[PDB]
Design a protein around this ligand. Sequence first.
Ligand SMILES: *[C@@H]1O[C@H](CO)[C@@H](O[C@@H]2O[C@H](CO)[C@@H](O)[C@H](O)[C@H]2NC(C)=O)[C@H](O)[C@H]1NC(C)=O
Lengths: 49, 681
Amino acid sequence: GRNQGNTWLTAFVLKTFAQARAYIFIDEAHITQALIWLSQRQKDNGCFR
Amino acid sequence: AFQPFFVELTMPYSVIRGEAFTLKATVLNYLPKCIRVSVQLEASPAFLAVPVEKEQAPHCICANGRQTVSWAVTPKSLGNVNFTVSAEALESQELCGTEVPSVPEHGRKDTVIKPLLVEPEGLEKETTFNSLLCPSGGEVSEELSLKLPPNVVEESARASVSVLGDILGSAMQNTQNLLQMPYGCGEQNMVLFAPNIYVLDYLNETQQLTPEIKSKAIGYLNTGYQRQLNYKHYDGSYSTFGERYGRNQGNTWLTAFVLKTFAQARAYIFIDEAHITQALIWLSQRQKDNGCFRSSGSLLNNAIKGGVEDEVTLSAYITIALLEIPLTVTHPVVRNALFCLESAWKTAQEGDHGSHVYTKALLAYAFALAGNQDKRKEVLKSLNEEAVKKDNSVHWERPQKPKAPVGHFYEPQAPSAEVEMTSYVLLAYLTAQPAPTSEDLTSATNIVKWITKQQNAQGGFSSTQDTVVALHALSKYGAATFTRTGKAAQVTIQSSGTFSSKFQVDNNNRLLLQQVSLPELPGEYSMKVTGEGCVYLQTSLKYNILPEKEEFPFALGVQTLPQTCDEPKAHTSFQISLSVSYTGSRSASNMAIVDVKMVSGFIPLKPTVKMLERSNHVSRTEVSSNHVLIYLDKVSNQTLSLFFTVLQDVPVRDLKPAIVKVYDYYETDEFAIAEYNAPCS
Ligand SMILES: *[C@@H]1O[C@H](CO)[C@@H](O[C@@H]2O[C@H](CO)[C@@H](O)[C@H](O)[C@H]2NC(C)=O)[C@H](O)[C@H]1NC(C)=O
């Protein structure tokens, strides 16, 4: 639950999900939930551990 | 256990203006001994007694001696009345037949005392008014004139007045019920879950309720939201069954209703912060840059929506959701639809028509969290001035005003409407960051009252659903009891007939109803108070109507019997066919309205069974056991009918008819009634 995860294979695609959100519909909600995961982890001051 | 002599009576019922019904009396001697019982009845000038068996005294009978003892009467007074008859045995009178013991114990005389009710002439209703006074250690007064007697009826129109603050919810018998995965179709899912979600807020917030029907509803809710996984849309929207409808909005109560409680429900089982924001991001997308974006209402069911498809009102219904989430740029966005509502409040300032449901709901909510919304402790007063159920019913008519723009007050949204309304009323009331000890309480506590007198868990309401909404009314009070409301409240009640009654209120008179009526056909009511803080007292004016009304728009097709009794067997048995529809039934709600009751002394059974069969391709198999409800199927394009009879419980009837007809179709139309009594006479 309360952890990060490796993020190449998503960040690699998370643009191409958006190049791939034309043939079949993955929504703007799948990219932002992918995103909102990230902003949560950004510390206010630190380069989060 | 034994007593040999027991009485049996004839119940008339709650019955007609005429009072010559068929009153009898029968006792039966189960003892073997044939004993005289001197009998009579203690009368009063409250009614117009008539002795049938004048000359002779019901005299004397034997073991299982059946006898009937029936006088006549024709009272004047209306309402419930205890009737006092007495039967006693005398000694040394061995002259009936052989002999007479006449020797009971302390259980000597058979005596019977019977509260029976008369329904007065015509049709019943009330009118009323609403008033507050709030001197802040000062003094204020007000004058109320209380009169709409057109088409006036003899000696029918009466009233009373009061105010209250009650604390200590006593009990919870309005609590319990259940329903579940329905059997007819999948469309009821919307009506299933929506109030079913706010049940979670009830377990601790009562100190009377039954939580485990709601702590099992979690075991249901642990599947509830699962249907909402499926009933959603991929893009973010929600429908009765979900996506495959892409670039549109959707109805948003049932989500916005929960989308907070999803967040109260994101503790037991984990729905993430991503499910609430995708729900949210759907919304921000639709907010136009400049306009109050165009949206049309033709969505999957008015079963869930007693609705008339006003996007702007719904443009607020998003914003309540926006208040839930603490994004705080969001909160400027609610000021957008606010200013869309600012139009709708100028509407609700003039007070002609804004549908009296919704700008209600959330204006209160809108700034509920902030802390400086004194301004909104005003605007509720409208809503409580807006024919609220101070009597704990919003009974049934508009004051006497025919015109085009009128409110959501006499519309075919027919759950009896007094519970749907007050929900979103009290939900507005006592979310006060400060003490709401001022006038948003003393009526709040009124709402506690009949929900605490709504003590029957049948569920066979004037609706089916609506009493699920009777509960939050009880619920949210559960901390509102933590309150103080008492000050130098000294109350003057004056009218024109040189009358003036005085009353007063305080922390211990806080919970004190001060009922008082007057006989005045005039209605004129000056009032004056003092003290600190505010308080809203209340009017109510009862009266009869329908002396004899004429024909009108609405078409009710009824037929009672073959045009006459004309036979000795009849006056008892005749099936009454009813065949009805009103065209104006357009994009407002489900079909809810009906009224079918008997005449004074007339009792149905196969009527129970003919309704039992009826299923005209859609139905809720609903029934009152004095009335009938299969209506949400379809409204009025193609009517339909049935037939049903009674048994004459009334051997003799003072000639005054009976009719049970209900009607509400459109905001401008005139009375729109069609009626017919029973003919056999
Ligand atoms: C009563 O039922 C009829 C059944 O045809 C409905 O007829 C439609 O009328 C509307 C409005 O004039 C048209 O838009 C439709 O083309 C007609 N049929 C449909 C729905 O496709 C009618 O709407 C119903 N109500 C009344 C009394 O107007």
